[PDB]
Amino acid sequence: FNGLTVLPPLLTDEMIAQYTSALLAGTITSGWTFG
Amino acid sequence: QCVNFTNRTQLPSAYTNSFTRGVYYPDKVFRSSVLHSTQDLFLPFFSNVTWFHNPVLPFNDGVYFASTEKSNIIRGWIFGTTLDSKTQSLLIVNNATNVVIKVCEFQFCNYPFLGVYYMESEFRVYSSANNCTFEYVSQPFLKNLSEFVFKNIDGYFKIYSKHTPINLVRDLPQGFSALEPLVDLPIGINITRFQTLLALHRSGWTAGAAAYYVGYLQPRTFLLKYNENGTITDAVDCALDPLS
Amino acid sequence: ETKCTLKSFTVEKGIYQTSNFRVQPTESIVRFPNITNLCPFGEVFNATRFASVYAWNRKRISNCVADYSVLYNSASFSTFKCYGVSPTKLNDLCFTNVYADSFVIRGDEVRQIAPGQTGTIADYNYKLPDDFTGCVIAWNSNNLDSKVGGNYNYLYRLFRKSNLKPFERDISTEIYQAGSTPCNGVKGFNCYFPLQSYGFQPTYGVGYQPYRVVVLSFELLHAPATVCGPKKSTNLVKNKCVNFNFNGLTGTGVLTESNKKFLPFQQFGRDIADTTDAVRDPQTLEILDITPCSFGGVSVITPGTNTSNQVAVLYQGVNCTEVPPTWRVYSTGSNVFQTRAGCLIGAEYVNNSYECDIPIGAGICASYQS
Amino acid sequence: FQTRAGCLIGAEYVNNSYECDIPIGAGICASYQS
Amino acid sequence: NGLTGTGVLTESNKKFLPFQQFGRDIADTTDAVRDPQTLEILDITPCSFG
Amino acid sequence: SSTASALGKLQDVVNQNAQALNTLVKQLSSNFGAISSVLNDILSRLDPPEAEVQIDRLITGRLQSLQTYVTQQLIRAAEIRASANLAAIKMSECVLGQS
Amino acid sequence: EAEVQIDRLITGRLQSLQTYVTQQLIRAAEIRASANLAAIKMSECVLGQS
Amino acid sequence: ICGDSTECSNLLLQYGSFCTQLNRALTGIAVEQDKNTQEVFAQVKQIYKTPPIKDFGGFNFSQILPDPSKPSKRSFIEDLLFNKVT
Amino acid sequence: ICGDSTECSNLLLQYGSFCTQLNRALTGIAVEQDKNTQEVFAQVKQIYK
Ligand SMILES: *[C@@H]1O[C@H](CO)[C@@H](O[C@@H]2O[C@H](CO)[C@@H](O[C@@H]3O[C@H](CO)[C@@H](O)[C@H](O)[C@@H]3O)[C@H](O)[C@H]2NC(C)=O)[C@H](O)[C@H]1NC(C)=O
Ligand SMILES: *[C@@H]1O[C@H](CO)[C@@H](O[C@@H]2O[C@H](CO)[C@@H](O)[C@H](O)[C@H]2NC(C)=O)[C@H](O)[C@H]1NC(C)=O
Ligand SMILES: *[C@@H]1O[C@H](CO)[C@@H](O[C@@H]2O[C@H](CO)[C@@H](O)[C@H](O)[C@H]2NC(C)=O)[C@H](O)[C@H]1NC(C)=O
Ligand SMILES: *[C@@H]1O[C@H](CO)[C@@H](O[C@@H]2O[C@H](CO)[C@@H](O)[C@H](O)[C@H]2NC(C)=O)[C@H](O)[C@H]1NC(C)=O
Ligand SMILES: *[C@@H]1O[C@H](CO)[C@@H](O[C@@H]2O[C@H](CO)[C@@H](O)[C@H](O)[C@H]2NC(C)=O)[C@H](O)[C@H]1NC(C)=O
Ligand SMILES: *[C@@H]1O[C@H](CO)[C@@H](O[C@@H]2O[C@H](CO)[C@@H](O)[C@H](O)[C@H]2NC(C)=O)[C@H](O)[C@H]1NC(C)=O
Ligand SMILES: *[C@@H]1O[C@H](CO)[C@@H](O[C@@H]2O[C@H](CO)[C@@H](O)[C@H](O)[C@H]2NC(C)=O)[C@H](O)[C@H]1NC(C)=O
Ligand SMILES: *[C@@H]1O[C@H](CO)[C@@H](O[C@@H]2O[C@H](CO)[C@@H](O)[C@H](O)[C@H]2NC(C)=O)[C@H](O)[C@H]1NC(C)=O
Ligand SMILES: *[C@@H]1O[C@H](CO)[C@@H](O)[C@H](O)[C@H]1NC(C)=O
Ligand SMILES: *[C@@H]1O[C@H](CO)[C@@H](O)[C@H](O)[C@H]1NC(C)=O
């Protein structure tokens, strides 16, 4: 580089996948009631 | 007028912690209730400073001098390069009468002193002085802690001072107080070394507890806090701590 | 004015900002220190003998009152040129710690007296800083500094181990080693004396006639002023927007008896970004505080040129006590009113209240019935 | 400590998990207990 | 050999043709040099900042 | 009544506006390459032909700063307008009826 | 004149950097609008029937 | 930019109308602010008043309704909000 | 801008605080991005399986 930097995102992709899995399992099992 | 001595008095120069001493008003501009950041030659916080209980010491960038003195034993100052009639030097003497300053090529022997007679008439600090330019007389400079800051910048010799009643025994007090400007000298001299002058009872000299603190100055950046009355009451060093 | 700024002969019913007004200053106040004494320029200009270039004679000038007109009209000065200030304004300012450097040098090297200039004496005898301020004066001195035997009193350096920092004085006559073999302090091969002597002879014409040079250097507000111009002070007034010149510090505003506490060494004050909020006058030594005299925008309220040709003028954020663009016509006996937005001229306040047209501000709004 | 975001001096790394206080990066963050 | 730059140098596994003198990657940033003495291929990395 | 720092949005909006004004006004104290940061001094010191040069440098610097300030203001105003439209919608749906 | 040339370089690179920052700001505004839309969609279609 | 200088004004004049659209933009912003507040709050056409006697089945809106004692006529929560933020 | 040069830095000094102002915006952008992701995805209180 030449004085420019790229910072990493706070939430890693594994954590994002975990959120999506949680959402999708909840909506499969509970419905809308879990919101 | 001076003869050598045999009792080679030596001051046990110990080291102590500077804490937060050596803050002076940088400019002649009134300000109030404001945080002002300035970069100048200061004395870094929490540094080590040399405390003595008469060697020649380098001047370097600047000098912080202090004396928590009783009865005002310390008398004068001598600055220069070689301290001889060959090279111009600076002398300051503050006796019981008006302080007197000269810039001359004085001639010094091994140890200069005033001396007192007991009705006091005794002065044999130097011997000869051939040629010089500037002289000055003004009000005298001086249990009580007296602080002085000596700077030599751009042909200007700035001398700042402060006085404070002190009751603490030994260490430099855990307090904070700015140093108001006292005098400017509009002559440039190659100041690199300096001495100190005392007042001995010349009847046999008896003066051994010449305790004073000495420190050197470095260029750094400070943040200063002016209250409602425009009095420097708090400061923060920059290049000391990640928090700072 | 609304037609002029909106570029139409027809203006619709609304409020339009036209311009802004400023209270004009009255008279002027010049206040200089009461000290008066002639400034000794003759001896620095009529000294019989001058030193060499590497021993340029420096003198400090302070605590004097100086006129530069006499130094201006003097046609004897071959060259008279200033860098940081106009030569005609020299007798209009106040400095402190003036420096006068006088010497005798080569007329061919007179161009070397300039910032960012490299020559022979410019780099090895006397160097100017790039940010130099002041004036340079030079005039021919063949009759004085040249003799039929040749005046060798004037030496100048040729060999140096390095360059010169600006404003230095070097007189060290050490032998110079021009080869790998060390001279060991002994002159010989590759060992030459750095200084060389001028051979000023009256037989030589222009370009070899020695020249006398004096350089004046100033400061710009780094200390209390001590060398003011030949101007004369005058009295001060308060509670009026005037132009003031406190010891070279110019400004325009209204002065008042200040209330802050100044320390004896403190001259003036400011709070944020060069806003000089107080001054100690050089004569009375009294603290006064400064504030710029009032100003603000102006707006118009019209019911629409299709309906009527009456207007109401609003001065924004200004106390109605002082208002009379000239427009004194709307200051004689017309109805006036005050509000949080400013002062309203040409409209009349009313008891009753109802949903309204064109707004003004702070909950107050206007319309056409007057 | 060496982490995907860089290097950390003056902080002790633990095994526990809490809610985030001062987001440092790469999924890890710091707090005060030391 | 006149190519001036600052960085950390390592050995490289790139394969120059027998007539180049140095390489670069993109946007005109030099990336590998061949030494005028030994004629061997090195690699350049800008030493870290942050 | 007790818990503080519950109004971060309004407070930081005010702080951003104050910071913009403060940096704008502080920018008036920069030489930009000229010999001074105060215009009256160069007016009162030197000859108008080069006063043109110095004043030109001042003018270009100050214009640049002012333009930057104005553009930032435009962006921030766009954000505030988006939030205000959202607030009006929420007042319509939630206050004047059940959502 | 070296300082003059440096001044030219400095002002040019300043203009370039400022332009970059302004473009970044505009693009960030666009992305934020899109993200708000996504949050609404995911709170109204995933967590309940619309 | 100039600050009461004829010379500076004359020099700036030859830049064209750089700083007429500046004032135009600032005024547009201010007018936009007034419109924002107007359209957010002025959703109503009349000014309704709660009756002097209040018995809403058991609910207590006293902390929310204005108190005639305070000259500001702002409710308790509104007073808290106004005092908190500076 | 200066590419590790001293004289360039000194010349750049007299431009005032442009760089503080510039770098104060990129930080806002980055914080905004993190907030965007958090408010899009972190809609739930627990983690289900
Ligand atoms: C101001 O005084 C200082 C000393 O307090 C001078 O600096 C030092 O002066 C000594 C004088 O003996 C130098 O020692 C010798 O100098 C010669 C010529 O420079 C050199 O060839 C020898 O090898 C030996 O070093 C010493 O170098 C010198 N140090 C420095 C850093 O200058 C100083 O010259 C005086 N003048 C000024 C303008 O500072
Ligand atoms: C010590 O005090 C005496 C008394 O004032 C001063 O020495 C001389 O004082 C007389 C009277 O004012 C002056 O005319 C002389 O010029 C003084 N001597 C010198 C050398 O200045 C002075 O205050 C002190 N003497 C010093 C510092 O040498
Ligand atoms: C002041 O006195 C000193 C000591 O004599 C002078 O120094 C030398 O004086 C002799 C007198 O014949 C000269 O030949 C030397 O050239 C002088 N050397 C130096 C280095 O000055 C000195 O000139 C006198 N004047 C001043 C102003 O110091
Ligand atoms: C600034 O100085 C003034 C005095 O010039 C201080 O005023 C003091 O106010 C208290 C409150 O009544 C009095 O009891 C003191 O007697 C006042 N001081 C004097 C010297 O009369 C003021 O407090 C100072 N501001 C500070 C210290 O922040
Ligand atoms: C240096 O000396 C010259 C000549 O003595 C001064 O020039 C003045 O010249 C006019 C007419 O030529 C005379 O009437 C004046 O009497 C001269 N002045 C003096 C003081 O004698 C010149 O002014 C002198 N330099 C300075 C700075 O005054
Ligand atoms: C306009 O100026 C006048 C005169 O200064 C102000 O009148 C003074 O108002 C204060 C209170 O606001 C009174 O205490 C004074 O007695 C008034 N007369 C004076 C000072 O001579 C008037 O208030 C100003 N208008 C505004 C809107 O501030
Ligand atoms: C310059 O060329 C000479 C030619 O002999 C090189 O000498 C040998 O080079 C080979 C291959 O480069 C090496 O394997 C040998 O170790 C070298 N031997 C000696 C005695 O030099 C030489 O390396 C080349 N470079 C230099 C700097 O001399
Ligand atoms: C409705 O609820 C409010 C809640 O504040 C009641 O206000 C009370 O007023 C009395 C008299 O001033 C106070 O002593 C109480 O402390 C208040 N309640 C609280 C919770 O602070 C109000 O009286 C209620 N209305 C009724 C009961 O008719
Ligand atoms: C310098 O300061 C340190 C700080 O603790 C102290 O320990 C030391 O004695 C001082 N003197 C020297 C010569 O290090
Ligand atoms: C020598 O001086 C020291 C320090 O003043 C003192 O303590 C000691 O008594 C002296 N000795 C003599 C013999 O004078």
Ligand SMILES: *[C@@H]1O[C@H](CO)[C@@H](O)[C@H](O)[C@H]1NC(C)=O
């Ligand atoms: C200044 O001088 C004038 C006349 O020379 C005098 O009237 C005035 O009192 C002086 N200033 C002071 C503070 O005494």
Ligand SMILES: *[C@@H]1O[C@H](CO)[C@@H](O)[C@H](O)[C@H]1NC(C)=O
């Ligand atoms: C002025 O107003 C009258 C009545 O409202 C209308 O008939 C007339 O057309 C208007 N004038 C213009 C120029 O439109």
Ligand SMILES: *[C@@H]1O[C@H](CO)[C@@H](O)[C@H](O)[C@H]1NC(C)=O
């Ligand atoms: C109403 O008019 C009366 C004049 O009888 C005046 O005293 C009063 O101030 C007016 N009030 C308002 C609100 O206009």
Ligand SMILES: *[C@@H]1O[C@H](CO)[C@@H](O)[C@H](O)[C@H]1NC(C)=O
């Ligand atoms: C914590 O994590 C480290 C990293 O793998 C592991 O070595 C350690 O056993 C874990 N537990 C504790 C108590 O440190």
